[PDB]
Amino acid sequence: NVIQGQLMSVSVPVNTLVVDTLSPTSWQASTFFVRNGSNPEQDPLRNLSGQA
């Protein structure tokens, strides 16, 4: 846990996971926009995803 607490991911690609069980009343995305410090420059298939 100490280790995990002090490793911050270098480059996180934009997240394209589909969450389709939101309540109809919840604000819902129309696109996979740049969220949560993700890096839109990053090709997710040419990454070092574990680099921190």
Query: Could you tell me how many residues of this chain bind a copy of itself (CB under 8 A)?
Result: 46
Q: Which residues contact 9 (CB under 8 A, 6 or more apart)?
A: 49, 51, 52
Q: What's the min distance (Å) between Cβ of 31 and a copy of itself?
A: 7
x/- letters, 14..43, toward a copy of itself (CB under 8 A)? -xxxxxxxxxxxxxxxxx-xxxxx-xxxxx
Judged by the rule CB under 8 A, the positions of this chain that interact with a copy of itself are 1-2, 4-8, 10-11, 13, 15-31, 33-37, 39-52
